[PDB]
Every structure is written in C-alpha cells, then in structure tokens.
C-alpha cells in the first residue's frame, strides 16, 4: 500500500544522496538538512547534465521520487527539494531565446511547424500500430506504456489550473478536469476507461505503478515539472500540444484497437477523446493567445514546447525498440 | 504590481518581518535569507499566540500575504514561509486526543451536535437578516463579507483536490469544482453570481479585493491552512461543515433579500446553493466515510472543525459590530 511513497523507494536507490533526501523528507527535517538535499541535489543534476551517464540515471531516479510519489506528508518538502533540480535542469535546456516578442501570426505559424515536424502521430511507432501488424504482445507494450502517461494526468493539470490566477482560466481547467474525471460518474474517468481496456487484454493497471524505463521516467517528470512551473508558459504549451494531438492519434488507435478485436466499450478511452475535446479546446485556446504579446511567455511556451518533444520522441524511441524485441 | 501581489501589501506594513519576507521573496533569495524569514516568523507567530497582541496582528497579516497574495512567482516560496507559521500554530490549537475512533453512527451524531451548537445560522446577526429589519446599508456590510468568503473558495477546494491522491476522490472534488466555476459557462461562476448581487445592491466585487479586518483575515488564514493541510482531515472538516450549513443558510439569506427588494436573477448566487449543495453532500460524504476507522483523521477532523468554528464566530461577531454601526 506504500510502494510509491518517498521513504519505502528512497531505500531501495543504490544512490548515496538517497540517503540524504530521505533524512530531508522526515517529520523534524531541519533547515540544515533540507537545504544539505538540495545541494546535493543540485550538483548531481548538474553533473548527470553535463554528461556523467551515472549522474545522470541518479538525478532522474531522485527526482521521479520527489515530484510523483503518493505520500502527501512529504509532497510540500519534496517539491521544494524538486525545485532545485528543476533550476539547473532549466539553465540546461535550448532557451528559445527570443529578445523580442514574436507576432502572433509568426507564433502560430513557428508552433504549426513544430508540431508537423515532430508529434507522436508520425513516429513509426504510431504508423506501426496503425498499420494492423503489431501483435497481441506489442499492443501489450504499448499500452503498459500508455497507462503510464494517462493515469495521473490529470493531477498535472490540476497543478496548472492551481497556477491559473484568473478566475475564467481555473474555470477553463477545471472544465477539462472534470471531463478527464468523468464528470458526473467517477467510474468514466479517463484513467478508469483506460484500466478497462488494460484489463480486456489481459495486462494490469496499478494505481501504485512505479517505472523502471529511463525514458518513461525522463518524459514523466519534465510533465510533472512543466505543469507546476510558475511561468504557466511552461504548461500550458505541453498542456495545448496535448489537447491539440489527441483527437486524430486518438481515432487513428481507437480504429487499430477495434481491428485487433476489442469492442466499442473496451477501446472508449479513445474513442471519448475524439469527440470530447476538439470544441474544449477551442476555448481553452484563448488562454494562450492571452499572452502571445508577452515575450517572457512565449520563450517559456516554445522552451518548454522543444524540450516536451525532445523528451517525448526518446520515450517513444525506447517503448519501440522494447516493442520490437517481442513478437 | 497590483495590489493584491505581495510586495505591494508587504511594503505597507510598518513591520521588520515585512522587509524580511520581502528580500526573502526575491527571485534570487538565498536559502540563508528564506531560513532566515522562516525562523522569524515561526517566532513571530510565537511571539503574538502566547500573548503579544501586536505581534499577534502582525504575524495574521503577514500569514494573509503569504498564503493568499497572487502573484504566482513567488506562490512556493511563499506557501513554505506560511508553513512555517503553521507548525506553530498547530502547537497551539487545542488538538482532539481520542485514542479510539468513534463509530460512524457516533461520528456523524458528534458532528450534528457540534454544528447545531456553533453553526453561523444561529448567529444574532443572521437571526436578524433573516427577520427583514436588516437596512439597505446593513445588508451592504453583509455582502462585502460575504465577497471575502466566496469569491476564492474554489481555490481552497482546489488544494484539497490536489491532495486527495484517490482518483475517485480527486474525481469528487472535481465536480465540486465544475459546478463552482460555473459549469459550462464561466459567466455563471458563483463568484460572478455573487459578484452580479453585490452590483445589484451598489457595491463592487474587486477580484484584488484585500481583507483589512482582522477577524476576516483570520478566517481567511485558517480555511487556506485547512484546505492545504497535508493530512486532508483538516480540509474535509471545513469543506463538509460548509456544504452542510450553505444550503438552510442560504434559502433564509435568499428570502431576506427577496424580502429587501432584489429580483429573483439578482439574488440567484443564494438561491443555486439551495437545490445544487444537498444532492453533492451525499455524495461527498463517502470521502469522510471511508476515512472514520483512522483515529488520526478523526482528530485532525475535529480539531480543524473546533478551529474553523472559533475563528469564524469571532468573524461573524465582528461583522455584526460593523452592520451595527450603519
Ligand atoms: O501523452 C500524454 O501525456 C497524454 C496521454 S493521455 C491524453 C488524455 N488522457 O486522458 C496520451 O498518451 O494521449
Ligand atoms: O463559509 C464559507 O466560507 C462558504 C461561503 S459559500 C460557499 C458555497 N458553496 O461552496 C459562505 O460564506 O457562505
Ligand atoms: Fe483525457
Ligand atoms: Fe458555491
């Protein structure tokens, strides 16, 4: 009942700073040894950065620890201890960098490209899937992987309308929320739907999951942090990126899904997508074209727009490579 | 700067601590000068609940900016700076010490007992509102109060919906949201219905509005420690003991403002709470429910719902001094 809370996944990190952390997290941390954490933190982030592969896999661990475990006595500080890696992860990324705001009709049409060049409908993983020819064991793959992404979105977006100061904007979120959680009936909730259909082939759907993909664990927590970044830029690209793909990656799979023999019922987690949010979109839109005239915001949402790809394009590259290795 | 941020109202109070938070809200703050704001608030606090009352006054309103300014650069700074304040505070609530959890049937019988002993309802102030001798002016005061209470509540719901790790639960306070946010139509927001009553009876509803009455802040302060609380008994004592008492409350504040002179539409902020609260009561109360077997959520529970109902009397009682006064 505790496999994904902090302390019970400190202990099994063969990471000295693990030991540390934890100590950060107890009940009567004090000042010193929260702030001890963060340095250690820090320096190991900076270090996995700037090429230290070993470094690098510690940092990752750490941090899927301290921004997505379940015990909320320790959420508080471990975000805080989350913020000082995110700080050097940050003055790491490709910076858009623009010294002056773009027009809006450049924005759009810089974001359109983005996106044509790089969605997840185009990977060859996504055509594969599309294409028929992936087996049972495959589409297992596949969506072991898929619940990952799916089961606690819904609390990243929570943490952006947390963010949304503007009364009409957390109204915005809040309608997306309750559509992801299955407005009326808690049993049509988005992570729900997609446990029935885990379910249906066999495969289980952990409310506890904790991932052991590197990759899985890179795109999982650059959400996690894109979504509570105070610069809201930061979330709600990823946030728009996603909203704006789902609808047509989500029908293409909902139409492999029935062509591999699962029912209307079984596969609804996609088929809701494809007609729920087109329109909610729409109007979640205005929250961005907001604040095109700002240059802070739109160097943040096209930062975090890039890196969200990068991280995302190397999460699907290895669910392939392990999709391919069965048959 | 607006004036709701919290460097603006930090910079207009004439306290040292003010100047510390400040510098220890700056976007380059050392962890020395947050430590350091920390310590002297965590004193502070101290300082004003063992007696000093001006130290009392200036730990409350530095606690209102902390937790409940809007400018969102500095909201994880200053959400770990009223932390500190918390702890302290919590050592000096009297804390509920059952040893064994009640039954639910004895659960839910100590809480009606408790809400018919404290509930708002009962107030003199409220007895009279609803009797219609309440002036236009009166009635002024009652609803500026009123802006204070409800037009952030969703935000404090919001909290606790981010703790609630249960999908089902979250999946409850998310349509405790939908419906407070107005649906499918944010123009029908119940902060904007209720802002659509206060300019029906002449007054603004500023969404920068910034309490400046002590016993508000006060209440202000302990929902949003409440709602934040990291063991989530605290906020589901306030959040249920408000969906319980809204819906009688409302349908005699409803009345009395019909009574006063306000249209149906004018008044629709009372009236929606009356048919929209009792049927998502049920339906939350599985969240209280299923967590009665856990000792400590009982007294996190009771001790949050003696707290809530301490600050809010002395928070009524202050309103009623202030519509005394017109
Ligand atoms: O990849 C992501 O982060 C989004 C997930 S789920 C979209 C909505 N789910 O309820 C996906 O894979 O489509
Ligand atoms: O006491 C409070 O804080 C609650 C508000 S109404 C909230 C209505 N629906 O959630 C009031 O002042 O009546
Ligand atoms: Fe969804
Ligand atoms: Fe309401």
Do not use: C
Request: net charge negative.
């Amino acid at each position: 009942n505790t496999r994904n809370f902090s302390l019970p996944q400190l202990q099994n990190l063969p990471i000295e700073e693990a030991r540390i952390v934890a100590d950060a997290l107890a009940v009567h941390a004090t000042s010193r040894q929260i702030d001890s954490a963060a340095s250690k933190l820090a320096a190991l982030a900076e270090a996995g950065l700037k090429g230290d592969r070993q470094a690098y896999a510690a940092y990752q661990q750490l941090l899927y620890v301290l921004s997505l475990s379940d015990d909320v006595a320790t959420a508080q500080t471990r975000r805080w201890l989350a913020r000082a890696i995110y700080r050097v992860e940050e003055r790491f990324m490709p910076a858009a960098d623009l010294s002056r705001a773009l027009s809006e009709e450049d924005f759009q049409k810089r974001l359109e490209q983005e996106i044509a060049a790089q969605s997840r409908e185009r990977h060859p993983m996504s055509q594969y899937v599309f294409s028929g020819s992936a087996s049972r064991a495959q589409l297992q793959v596949f969506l072991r992987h898929q619940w990952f992404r799916t089961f606690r979105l819904y609390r990243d977006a929570a943490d952006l309308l947390v963010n949304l100061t503007d009364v009409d904007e957390a109204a915005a979120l809040a309608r997306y929320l309750y559509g992801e959680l299955g407005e009326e009936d808690e049993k049509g909730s988005h992570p729900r739907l997609l446990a029935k259909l885990l379910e249906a082939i066999g495969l289980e759907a952990d409310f506890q999951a904790v991932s052991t993909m590197p990759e899985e664990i890179a795109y999982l927590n650059n959400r996690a942090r894109a979504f509570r970044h105070a610069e809201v830029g930061w979330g709600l690209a990823v946030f728009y990126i996603t909203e704006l793909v789902v609808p047509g990656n989500h029908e293409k799979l909902y139409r492999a899904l029935l062509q591999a023999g699962l029912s209307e019922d079984q596969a609804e987690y996609y088929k809701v997508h494809i007609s729920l949010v087109p329109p909610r979109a729409k109007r979640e839109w205005q929250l961005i074209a907001r604040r095109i005239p700002d240059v802070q915001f739109q160097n943040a949402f096209l930062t975090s727009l890039s890196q969200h790809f990068r991280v995302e394009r190397a999460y699907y590259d290895a669910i392939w490579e392990e999709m391919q290795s069965v048959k």
